[PDB]
């Protein structure tokens, strides 16, 4: 109960909110893959290797609830 | 000399010609990566794994003439 209240306080101290469920990771993994071609050098492989590691988080969320992980990633990315 | 003549005969028997030097591979590796999103299923990973294996040929051409292979691939793809 006090951890719930101390989460409401983390909203009220800074008035933004974002969806759970892995909805944030897949917008970030779009912005990076559109930004990486501007950086151009060997550094381009390190940014795209960052994006693959953030999407690689919500597999650990799907794989954990009994689902088939890869298809239930591909459906979200296509959506 | 007869293998040279028997190459001119391979042009004359069918009146098309294409550039050497790895110029064909990098147009094919563009068409495939634009076509793969239409196929959509697990099969999409097999087509993109085909494109990476055709570009992977001209590294064996650059790596062989003493050059640094990766950058001399990236310059061609950007061009």
Curated annotation (Swiss-Prot), chains A, B:
Protein's gene: thsB
Family: Belongs to the TCP-1 chaperonin family.
Described purpose of this protein according to its UniProt entry: Molecular chaperone; binds unfolded polypeptides in vitro, and has a weak ATPase activity.
Subunit structure: Forms a Heterooligomeric complex of two stacked eight-membered rings.
Protein name: Thermosome subunit beta
Residues represented out of the complete protein: 397 to 475 of 554
Coiled coil regions in record: none
